[PDB]
A paper describes a structure:
Frh is a key enzyme in the metabolism of methanogenic archaea, where the reduction of carbon dioxide to methane involves the oxidation of four molecules of H2 by a number of different hydrogenases. Frh is a heterotrimeric enzyme composed of the 43 kDa subunit FrhA that contains a [[name]]-center, the 26 kDa subunit FrhG with three [4Fe4S] clusters, and the 31 kDa iron–sulphur flavoprotein FrhB, which contains the [name]-binding site and has one [4Fe4S] cluster and an FAD. Our cryo-EM study showed that the Frh complex is a dodecamer with tetrahedral symmetry. Electrons are extracted from hydrogen by the [[name]] cluster in FrhA, and transferred via the three [4Fe4S] clusters in FrhG and another one in FrhB to FAD and from there to the substrate.
Refinement of this smaller dataset under otherwise identical conditions resulted in maps with better resolution than the full dataset, and the best map, with 6 frames averaged, extended to 3.36 Å resolution. All three subunits were traced completely except for a few N- or C-terminal residues, accounting for 893 out of 903 amino acids. In the new map, two nearby density features, modelled as extended loops before, were clearly recognizable as alpha-helices (194–201 and 208–215) that accommodate the missing residues. The resulting shift of residues brings the cysteine residues C206 and C208, which are conserved in the FrhG family, near a strong density on the dimer axis between two FrhG subunits. The cysteines of the dimer partner are just a few Å away, and the density in between the four cysteine side chains is strongly suggestive of a coordinated ion. The function of this ion is most likely to stabilize the dodecameric complex, but its location between the two medial FeS clusters at a distance of only 9 Å, which is less than the distance of ∼10 Å between adjacent FeS clusters in the electron transfer chains, means that a role in electron transfer cannot be ruled out. In the Falcon II map, the clusters are not just featureless blobs, but their tetrahedral coordination (mostly by cysteine residues, or, in one case, an aspartate) can be clearly seen. The FAD cofactor in FrhB has continuous density in the map, and its folded conformation with the adenine and isoalloxazine moieties in close proximity is confirmed. For the new Falcon-II map, we used an Frh sample with a large excess of [name], but the [name] binding pocket is clearly empty.
Author numbering:
A (entry chain C), B (entry chain C): 2 to 281
C (entry chain B), D (entry chain B): 46 to 273
E (entry chain A): 2 to 386
F (entry chain A): 310 to 386
Write the structure that this text describes.
Amino acid sequence: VLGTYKEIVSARSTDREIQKLAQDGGIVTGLLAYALDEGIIEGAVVAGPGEEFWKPQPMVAMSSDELKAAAGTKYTFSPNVMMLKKAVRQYGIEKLGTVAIPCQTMGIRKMQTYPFGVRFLADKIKLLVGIYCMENFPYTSLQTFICEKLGVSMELVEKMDIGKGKFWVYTQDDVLTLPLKETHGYEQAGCKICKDYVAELADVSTGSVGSPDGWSTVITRTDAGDSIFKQAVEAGLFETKPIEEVKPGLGLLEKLAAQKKEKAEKNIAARKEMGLPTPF
Amino acid sequence: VLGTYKEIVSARSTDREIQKLAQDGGIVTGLLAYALDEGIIEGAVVAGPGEEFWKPQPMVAMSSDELKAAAGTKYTFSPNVMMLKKAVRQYGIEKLGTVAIPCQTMGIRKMQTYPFGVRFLADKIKLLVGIYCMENFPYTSLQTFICEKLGVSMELVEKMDIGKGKFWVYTQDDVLTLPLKETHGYEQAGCKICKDYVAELADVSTGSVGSPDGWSTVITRTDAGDSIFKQAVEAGLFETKPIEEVKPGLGLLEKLAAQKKEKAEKNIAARKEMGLPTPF
Amino acid sequence: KPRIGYIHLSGCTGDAMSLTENYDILAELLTNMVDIVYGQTLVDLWEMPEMDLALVEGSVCLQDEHSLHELKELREKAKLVCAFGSCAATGCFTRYSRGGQQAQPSHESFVPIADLIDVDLALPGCPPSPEIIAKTVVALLNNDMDYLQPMLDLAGYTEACGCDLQTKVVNQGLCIGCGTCAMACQTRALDMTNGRPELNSDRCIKCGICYVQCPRSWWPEEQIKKEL
Amino acid sequence: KPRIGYIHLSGCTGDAMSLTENYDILAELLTNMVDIVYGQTLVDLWEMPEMDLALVEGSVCLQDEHSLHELKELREKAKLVCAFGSCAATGCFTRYSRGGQQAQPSHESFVPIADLIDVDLALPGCPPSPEIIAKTVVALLNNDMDYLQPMLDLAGYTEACGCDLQTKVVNQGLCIGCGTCAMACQTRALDMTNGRPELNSDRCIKCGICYVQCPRSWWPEEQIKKEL
Amino acid sequence: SERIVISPTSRQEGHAELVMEVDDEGIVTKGRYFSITPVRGLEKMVTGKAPETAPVMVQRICGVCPIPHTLASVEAIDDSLDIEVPKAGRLLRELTLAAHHVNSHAIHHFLIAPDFVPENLMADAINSVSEIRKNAQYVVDMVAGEGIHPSDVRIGGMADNITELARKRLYARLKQLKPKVNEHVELMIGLIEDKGLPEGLGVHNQPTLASHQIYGDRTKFDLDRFTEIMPESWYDDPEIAKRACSTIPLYDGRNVEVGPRARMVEFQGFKERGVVAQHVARALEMKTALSRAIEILDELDTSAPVRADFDERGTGKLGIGAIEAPRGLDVHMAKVENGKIQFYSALVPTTWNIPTMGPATEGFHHEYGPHVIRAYDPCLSCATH
Amino acid sequence: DFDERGTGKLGIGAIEAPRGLDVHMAKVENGKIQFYSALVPTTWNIPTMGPATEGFHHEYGPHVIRAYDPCLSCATH
Ligand SMILES: Cc1cc2nc3c(=O)[nH]c(=O)nc-3n(C[C@H](O)[C@H](O)[C@H](O)COP(=O)(O)OP(=O)(O)OC[C@H]3O[C@@H](n4cnc5c(N)ncnc54)[C@H](O)[C@@H]3O)c2cc1C
Ligand SMILES: Cc1cc2nc3c(=O)[nH]c(=O)nc-3n(C[C@H](O)[C@H](O)[C@H](O)COP(=O)(O)OP(=O)(O)OC[C@H]3O[C@@H](n4cnc5c(N)ncnc54)[C@H](O)[C@@H]3O)c2cc1C
Ligand code: SF4
Ligand code: SF4
Ligand code: SF4
Ligand code: SF4
Ligand code: SF4
Ligand code: SF4
Ligand code: SF4
Ligand code: SF4
Ligand SMILES: [Fe+2]
Ligand SMILES: [Fe+2]
Ligand SMILES: [Fe+3]
Ligand code: NI
Ligand code: NI
Ligand SMILES: [Zn+2]
């Protein structure tokens, strides 16, 4: 199931630019950008854009214009969380909000619970945003798909998204898709045991799944995130329609989340049966 | 007691140069140099002379003239044994003989027994020479003695030797001595547990103790070393007089060796009583 | 009222400073929150009273007669002995030391106090962040061990390379490349090459914060309660 | 007649080469001294016979289905399983690996075989010197375990930094600065600053030869018999 | 039809699985060779790590052809850095490479000897290879520190330079070795023909590649010509493409077989082609190597410095080092920025081969087909790294 | 940007620590330190502190020492 949440909605940011470049909803960029206006967050750390093509390197952007450049989806490790110490420390930020995969997200909260050598950082994060991640792959793992599978340069894909039951590459003059079952080997060994499809820890969680194309479903895990969201909707940046009403049913998203847990659980049994240490 | 040995003798090398610069007997330099003539050893690794003053840095000398420069005593760690791989490898040496403290000496034999990643080196050493060491001290530990204790520069001491019951510094125009009980803190923590006063492992062992000043007592642990020695005495390089006859009695040397064992043994009990790992 | 005792065997003393860092708590805290006894730095009574917990700043040194002598005394005196700061917990930068620097050229060996005496809990860091240290004290003061379960576990930890999260986790195939562990580097030795952590030894103090802060290394579901 | 089996899971294969190095023994040795079975390199039978001892060149990889599958088979097949070369014994240079190099970007984790299955003895080295490997085989063939006492002990060894003789020995205050361990570096990473060993990580493969060759780490009085 | 899978193929370093599609007669139709070894991942592990490391980690890629790997890495790095080895330093590298070719080839003979040599001979045959092998090692270890895995070669020079006493000691050993090696090849050459594998075995139309007979020239190489493509494209089967652990490196879009056979045809002039031909080529090839061994040795400065001092922090610019490994051409490209490698790529001689090997095992009855593969003497650990 | 490999020549850096003057001398040869020496502000003080605690009744005497606010960890390193 989903992690306990205040509410579930599917929403899109109003702005033309967010719709234009945002992967789905444009909610992460819109939600993050709005906070800047409100000032709940001084700056946020958003992955991209890296030296390689379609390679994300984490960057902390005070500027809204900068957040827009960051906005998009790159399916590779971008260790967002490395920045957090750097962002708070030099471009001194009293409160900073970051976009975190569920995975990174697991990493931050314990740290907020158990700083253990993070000084003063722990208080500083104001809004943490969690993006559902089924699996994500090494740049090379990713690179093979685009080329052996899709016969296109890394340069050409303007945007890449994993559509339900498929991988989609959007290139000027074309869209190319390959089945996920094709994808199965490549994602990192670490993710084999990643329990949380949704970001349970994250204050607000945004995902493509369970919402129509161009519509992003945002689920508000925690009250602070909820507040920021309520404020934004009042702002009218986002058009929100309750999730249950719009197909696909959020029950489908729930099923996807459940599937992930089934996958994690046996893997752990296998790792547990075997010698090698396991967290969880 | 002494390690099992073929014979005990007190001897001096004949040559004026060996007597002139050799610490005691001049046997190590004489024995090593002769082998070069005979050719049992292609080259040997002898500590000194280092970049610092009276600091030994190990050097492998094919040349006899070079061995003479090496000859002397420097009471500091010189890791002779580091060279052995280097000497055999580049200045390619089929058979190489080295002068080793008992301590180093312990290190080589196991290696000859258990090469474990030393290739071909193990066979190559032909004559290993062991020098009795009661204790030896870090360069700084040594440095304090010469200056706080003796009020002399490190430059001035032409030769430093530990006389029985004393430390002797020989400087042009003077000889300066301080009691060993003064010395007690400084020698390395490692030596606290060094069992072997004599070099039991070494093929032939040479020490000042138990022989009159300027006379060195050489005890032949093993047959190959014994052979090289028998050959040298036939050579007449060394004047040899059986040990028992000349005071001080080798029984005194034996007593000194015993004292060392008593010191090692309790230290080990203390280390054993305590958590920290111990070899031996 | 609860008695906290901190004895610094051989420590940069950052750990103590971190303790003073939690200012808002601090002024009241010594006065109201906690009782501090037998701290040479913070107090002047030479022989230690029994103390509810003892905080030991620095790695013990084998050679120094006093440090060893003091450590043995400490175990009886402190009902609970907790080693804090890496230097007590992991031996920290101390490990790099090779003795032979004057004066006292002999002192070359330092070991985490933990190896010498069983230690109830050690929380590492160089220093530990002030907040963690405050959180434990309130926790210890308020007597909850669901929270300190991770630390009780961490007492075992001892030697910790930067090198080790690579052996401990990335090798296991646990690592997901989140980047959390690099952020938890006081030294800043760790950094992330795509996407795994790559660290450069010239600059690692072996504090151990990176092994501890990886989500993968051990996940408390304790926190979930804390947010909500 | 005794059956020796060597299976190389993932190894530079130096270890096998070292085996051929002992030339004087070697030509006769396969023929007279020992029987070699189920070596893909040295023989062509696909499924392993029971073997008196099994020599495993390289660290197993968790991801690869075959290597793991093979390792499980090996334990039944080999009456005695011995892991040789650091790559089986300590995981060696393998540890540095972070997976993600094509093809097969996924394979990122390698572990010493020893962790997966109990291993009777492992003799490390990268490769092991030919002589040690010959000495063991004669020893194993001639059935003496006073000699192999150190190795049986070494099977436990697993992770080994260059860093570790500093923690394992120099810290303990054991080190006497003989210089033996630096000489036993295939990499040449170790070198002696006065007078202790100082090693530079950029160049250490974690083979573990330095911890093993220090006289201090473990002294056999076995050798004394060998000379005399 | 029926497809027979041999896994792993015997007598070659590492593991490769050969998959065959056969007609009723059993003449093969498609031969697929892929390396199923797990990737130790050196190319990646080196990245973001210091230049000083790169030669040490890299040579572990392959403990048989370690010297070529070390040489290539240093050359690639020194080139990116721009250090200039002094001539004695350069000569030492060439001298080591030659000793290595000689040795490596001998090791190959030991491995394939069982098919080739009668048992009565074989104990004697094996002994000789060990004899030739043992002398060659003396040179490789003596010049380059312990070898295999010599640690002595270093960026911009050699760690130290052999003493005249060492150089002399070496020479007699190499010069004296020359008669045995000459005879050894003839016996090997004599043996290989006797087997009489069907003529026309293992003939492929693939282009050969050589830079130099021993030491490789970077200049005679085209980044423009070169390309690397993942097995996923190249292989017929999804299963096989996924299984294969090795990228295929394409020369001018053409699968390329690079070998002693290739090194001879390009440089020596070796008109004959066959599997028997590859075998013949391996013998004469060591024959040539060993010569240079002694050649460079006689004229060696012995006091000229080996090390050239260099600046580790590097311009972004990438450099290529190509040297000829006993199993075929090799190149290392590295770019050093900030004194830590930013991009590292290695193409090992086997890597070039593995695509050509499958087409080679077609036609002749498959029992033959592993014979073709074994002729290439591939070492996978090199192919995959 | 700078070149790590260094001339043998030693250099001194002196900055004022809260407890008194401090200097670090280092010589870098081959890019690895060859001689390193640190004198920390307390180190300078410790000899002067003993003579300072003379005269006035000793109960006072620790007061003098404490005024210097020495940090030993600095003094000894
Ligand atoms: C690795 C990965 C896997 C995902 N898998 C799914 C999925 O299976 N189903 C699904 O519905 N949604 C998935 N998402 C998220 C989803 O695809 C949309 O990207 C996002 O949830 C919708 O936000 P948006 O419409 O506002 O897009 P945007 O406004 O473009 O928001 C995208 C934000 O994601 C951040 N980001 C990009 N790449 C990374 C990265 N590697 N790590 C951390 N942050 C990053 C960027 O900073 C950017 O600000 C995934 C995202 C990532 C990074
Ligand atoms: C650290 C140390 C402690 C010693 N303690 C004693 C003692 O207590 N009683 C005693 O009778 N003799 C002791 N000796 C040896 C003795 O003092 C004479 O040095 C030697 O035994 C006599 O040989 P010789 O007269 O031929 O002198 P030489 O011909 O001068 O022989 C001296 C040789 O010792 C080698 N050497 C010098 N320093 C070192 C070092 N640090 N490590 C290894 N090798 C070195 C040199 O290569 C030189 O070749 C000690 C030697 C050392 C190095
Ligand atoms: S699948 Fe899990 S471990 Fe992998 S990126 Fe997503 S959240 Fe992280
Ligand atoms: S006292 Fe023992 S450990 Fe110390 S130098 Fe002498 S032999 Fe070595
Ligand atoms: S743990 Fe860190 S801050 Fe504390 S004494 Fe040790 S080195 Fe200093
Ligand atoms: S926290 Fe762990 S998994 Fe995450 S980036 Fe760091 S080492 Fe990798
Ligand atoms: S990498 Fe950083 S956190 Fe990890 S042990 Fe080293 S100094 Fe500490
Ligand atoms: S132990 Fe060394 S030589 Fe053997 S496979 Fe491993 S890295 Fe190669
Ligand atoms: S062998 Fe051990 S004691 Fe001897 S020099 Fe090396 S590390 Fe130091
Ligand atoms: S320092 Fe040398 S011997 Fe020790 S582990 Fe590293 S590479 Fe091996
Ligand atoms: Fe490659
Ligand atoms: Fe100082
Ligand atoms: Fe190769
Ligand atoms: Ni190879
Ligand atoms: Ni200070
Ligand atoms: Zn380490």
